[PDB]
Amino acid sequence: CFSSWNDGSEGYEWKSRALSEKRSLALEFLGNVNKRVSIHDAIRLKADINKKAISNVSCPSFFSGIEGAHLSPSDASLLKEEFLCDYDPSDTKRMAKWVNLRSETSDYQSYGAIPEGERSLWSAWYLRNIKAG
Amino acid sequence: FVDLETGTSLYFRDTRDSAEAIAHAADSKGIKGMDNAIDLYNEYRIVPDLYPEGFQWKHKLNTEYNQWRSNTWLTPDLIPKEHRGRFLCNFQLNIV
Amino acid sequence: YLLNKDDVLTRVLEVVKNFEKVDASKVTPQSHFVNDLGLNSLDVVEVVFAIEQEFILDIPDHDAEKIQSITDAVEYISQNPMAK
Amino acid sequence: SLFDPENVHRLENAMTHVKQVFADYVHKKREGVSTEAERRMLANLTAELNLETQKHLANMFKYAEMRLRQVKLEERHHQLAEIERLRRMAQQRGGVKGRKGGSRKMSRMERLKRVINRAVGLDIAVAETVLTEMQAQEEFLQFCEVFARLTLGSGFKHTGKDENLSAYIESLRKLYSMDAATLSTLDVVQYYSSKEGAHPVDWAKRWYERALLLPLQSTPEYQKLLQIQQRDESVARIKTQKVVNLVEKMFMDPKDKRLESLHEKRLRYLAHMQMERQIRCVRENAKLFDGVENMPEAAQCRELYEKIMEKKTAQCNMTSPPERSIAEELRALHQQRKEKMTMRILGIIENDVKTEMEWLQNMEEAERPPLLPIPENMSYVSAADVQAWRELREDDERKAANPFERRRRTFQPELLGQAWSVPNKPLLFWGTGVSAVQQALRHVAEDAERKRQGLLLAPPYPCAENPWGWRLAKDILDDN
Amino acid sequence: ASGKDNTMSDDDVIRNIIKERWKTLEFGDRNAGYPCTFGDYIQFLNEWFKSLDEEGMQRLREHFDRRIRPLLAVMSPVDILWLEALTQNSPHNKEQLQRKIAFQTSLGTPEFFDMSKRLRYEINEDYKVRDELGPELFALWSKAPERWPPERLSKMYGLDFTLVRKILVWHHFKACYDACVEPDWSLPKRLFALEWIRDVRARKHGLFYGKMRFAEQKITFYSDRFLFRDLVNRREASYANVWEMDDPYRFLQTEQDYEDYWGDNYDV
Amino acid sequence: PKGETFEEKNEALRMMGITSSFQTKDLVPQPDRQKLLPLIRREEGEIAGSLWAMDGGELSYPKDGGGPQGWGVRLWRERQLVKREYQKVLDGYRPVPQLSTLGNSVRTAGDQLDIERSGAQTPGELSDYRNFPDNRFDGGQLKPESEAAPAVPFSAEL
Amino acid sequence: ERLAWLRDVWAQIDADYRSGDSARQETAAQEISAALRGEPNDYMRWVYETKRELRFAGPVGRRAIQEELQAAELPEVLDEEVNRYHDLKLNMMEIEREVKAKYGVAGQQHWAELQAAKDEEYI
């Protein structure tokens, strides 16, 4: 809920899932030898099958999508921006700061990000971006 | 397993402490402690710290990843205040 | 349609030369396997299998009995119309 | 208020929670196992995020500076478009007044339209013009999409053969040099920043002309509708008493000899965003309605294939010829904008969790075994292959003689060190093996004398005299 | 899949299937679905190396230097232990090695492994200097050496002087050794004449030798202006590199005198 | 004498019946540009060994007995020199190397899929492929550099 | 030149401390109190991180960062400052405090299993 989103040991059933997901991804990225295999035709086809299977999944929209058919300066600004600007390239980049695109995968996809000194299984390098606020 | 830039000696004197040096190198060896070089004259080596002042981050330590490991006796207050963070060269100890 | 007898003579000349028991100098365009080349009867069965691998068509068991030399082996393949 | 920058430590935390429910939902969509509870949890999270966004719209209008800059740019663009539309309407009204002075009803209608525009605080004529231009552009895009779907059986395939950005900016430069006949880059980027919201058509028109090989400027009616729409839309002491804005003096003059490269980069950026909007809307048309092209009826495909054959015959013939009520609707508009922006948030969250689940499933799919190869015929080079490659073998030997053409041999396979050459003899199977059978006869004779004598081999376990344990593979036919 | 390989040539499709059949190779039992065992592969390597002459061994070592040597220079010993466990394909040894923390944590990272491409490119660049630029320099020096001397070739190609002379000597000795012909021993005496007089000495076993910095104890030519002018006038009247075709070697009017001077008595 | 330039050299090779593989100076291997290879050759020795081998005895390779002269210490010291070069890469003194087959075969399989569908040579091109998803083609192929235009701010007009 | 850039930076803090608004003066007092205690700037951390990401990005991302930040007056930062910031080891107790403040008992169980893995690697 809304009260389960703040800090202070609230929302334990989903905070412990997220903290176990990032550690288990870090343990298989470093300590799993069987994942360092060059890809073959069984991997190349079935990943493209698994690429199209996730793309066939459509998100269930809510009831918001249903529709039918001296002014203030704040009220006239919302009506003028909706009619004159149908596509805004400046606001869609503000979404990238909120969603934080590739949050759990760019920790391992960057070039030279993780140092050699923190390449052990006891090391806590996936907790550097944790800010309590 | 020596490094020809840092792990060599300047003097001719044979102190015959190479067995204790390789024993302490095996003692300081860990999971990645065998990847770096072995210095037989590490007990006589004095590497000056080049960062006495600077930005002191809270989320980060004052130590670095690729730092030369100290001796059993080497403390950072041996070099005095007027010479702290000045020497760009590593020193070697010889006992008279 | 039918392959001429000039090329299939040279085709069956090369596959009999690469047999390890025979020599390359003993083989003539008119020669017998058991008499001239000095071959046991078990590898005469292996001779017609080399013809079944050179010419990919399967020779039947009754027609394999009728061939016993190289002049009959070059004659039987040239009459078979399914050869490429 | 959640999207304010003071609550960001909450915000991404909430996002991870939203991520987690999508982390099961697509999962419980892709196996089809009780996705209703995940949909209900996503609806509750969407209602909470809708309340957060309803507070955060005003909270980011008050605090966030990028939204204020976007609002100022949108207000300046709307004022420029309204000034251009008012100048065109004033020119039309001046022409109508110079043609006939008895225009009292037209003046009353113009006063009523000006009062309605002042009450709405916007130019309704420019809004209806932009709506009509976008509708005609969408109709032209749908017509060209169904024509490319039915005629050639393909859709939109963006590859390197298309019109690049340099050809696009050069085509726009020569187009507006055909329009005005005297121009610079500053006037071009000023016109493109003044328009800045009109949907461009010419790049997709050129791509469909390259795909269909027919002229499209005169034959369809939607192109002519877009063209006629683009036709009808196209003292000193007082200045001393006027205060000078210090913010304007910190910027250079636009007619400065140091700002040419900035204008070129602005032209490239505006052409890039125009081409990206064109690729966006054509890909939207190819994901919305081109999925039905694969499920289309056979009659609509076959008749259009006959039409394409008739067009090819016509092209061959052409080649032969050549040779209390306002506030409720305003609250509805505010709720529409808030639900639109929270759906824009949730779609980006959906794409992020979709690509992260794709990356984790691609991590998972590495350890699976490969495919089984189908059985082929046994590797055999016939005597006809030997006699067919004899001249190539001798030419490869001649090329292996000289060093300058040693690597220019056409047939060069390689093992570890050696280069394979063209074989001069057929490689057989049935003729070989005459020595191993005799060695096996001698070995089974000595092994029968061994079994009658009770002898053991060298110790197959890794003993001291044999450090590598060398074991013969125990075969079931070689049991005794 | 249609979108990945829409249109490519037949050499590309057979290269792709050759690559995919190379990487899908495993070592198990022959009847269990796998093509061969590890010991059969070791027997193939042993009897393949036995069937090579010295040219085949030379090409084998060149293939080691070009491809396998940078990968061995970059990879750690735990990485080649992992590769050995992948060769043997035993579940027992793989399960035994997966228990080790030092085996799993000390695996190599790909950004460090990307130096193998630059090292392989440098080794293949040196082999391209040798095998591809070599015969062109050999032809240009062997047709008209007075028109293209080794210093002209070293200036117009920019490799080195001694490297070009080593390329010429190696190419002539490689052409002689691969044809079962006794090599012309006078060629290092002709390309390294000053180096033959300076460096090549008879060396005894149980003692170390030195090198003379100068031949004579003399006064320098910078000490006086007249000695400086004499050195400059002598250097203008001198060559920089003398070869077999120059005017001091113009008294060799007979090929018998040519083989007498450069053969077996050049040190005398 | 003529033949110092490459046009006269190629004409003389045409008169001798030899088509030159190196027409101009940009097709010259230029061994002075090497940085890691002379550093390896200076300290330890020749990493090739069989580059100069007449009959099979002029090759420089470590001994098979082991110890300080064996293969393990030499490969360890070569790996230390490559580690010094890689530390020079990480601090920005050297450019970032391209993607090798050894580096790609040890990577995460999804990264191998992204590399083989993008055609990226350098990992910087892979970072541009991921951080700009609107840039690629419809088959996952990477678009060139000239087809991207960033937004220039008005604050450069001060 | 860094001292000139710091003068141009702290002119803004002096203007906000002498503006008269409550929020400007409180943020300027926060900046002064952070500078007097020796606490480093987060702007410098962002500058070092974006310089390293400009170094390790490809040419599209490099051109995007260079075109976004051409008008933003950034200090001329050497590569050695970015390498000095990057090569520092992270503090364990600060990470523990952040993981026990951001997350509650789940953070304590995660740190307990982390210390369990540490003592297992010690074995």
Next chain:
Amino acid sequence: EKLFQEMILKKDLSPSRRTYHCMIFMHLSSGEEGGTARALRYLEAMERAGIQVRPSLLKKIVRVNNAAGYKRDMKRRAR
């Protein structure tokens, strides 16, 4: 040489040390016969007119002559 003697004889200008070094190194770098015989004439003109003869000039004379030995040998082999 034409502009050199036009500067010396007509305009009566005393040449500097750098333009003496240029006429030295031009005749030294040219592989024709008698180039050093005129470079030593320029050295004598530097000596008897008070122009400074630096040791770096002498080391560069030796280095440039040893470098232009290649051009001298090419112009001798062309004959």
